[PDB]
């Protein structure tokens, strides 16, 4: 879930 409010979780930023 949203277990870390500091993390960007947009998949475009990690796998694009």
């Amino acid at each position, epitope marked *: 879930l*949203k*277990s*870390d*409010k*500091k*993390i*960007e*979780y*947009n998949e*475009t*930023w*990690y796998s694009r």
Partner: antibody
Amino acid sequence: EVQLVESGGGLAKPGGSLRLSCAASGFTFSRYAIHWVRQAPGKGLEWVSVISSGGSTYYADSVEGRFTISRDNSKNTLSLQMNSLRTEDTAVYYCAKDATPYYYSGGYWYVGNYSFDYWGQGVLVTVSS
Amino acid sequence: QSVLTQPPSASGAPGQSVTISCSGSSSNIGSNYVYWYQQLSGKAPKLLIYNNNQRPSGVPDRFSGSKSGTSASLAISGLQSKDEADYYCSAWDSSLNDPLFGGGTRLTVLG
């Protein structure tokens, strides 16, 4: 000059809805997460919500599920939709720019450091029967 | 691991110093950056100190920040009547996964 000009707010009934908006200028909008922080009359500050540059959204426990934050990077605008309003939601609401631009570290992208260097003028939200 | 504990009020003499404390735990103050905000009457808060002891641009050096264990402190020297405001500490809590504010400290300048 950095400006965060808020609009919206006002009065609602318990269970009703209100929309807040924040217009940002004077800085690179897409480099910073933007938060909402509220303050009940004569009370202290409480972090409400955050939206990151990439659209990641986080909320305080008391408003999760009832509040929806969103942003438009092409319009340099931000909005907070507030549904299922409760009496304890009565407060002045500020939009607040994160003081730290998003950054990459240790394999993860970080939206900001949850400190606020610029604040909007504040908009009053009252929830009452 | 709690809500940051600040004394409701603090006072100091003009031209003298005052120290506002902020007590937390190991998961917030003890392991994370502390920030301090000043809020004048009827105005929005203003970032006063960041990263435990750093001063933003335009903050005079008579405002100082420090940290020790699970506590943090904001020191104000050369007290002026304009310094009367509410002062808030703030820190991340990794146990709660939440940003925390202190309850605020209302500063009175005597005289």
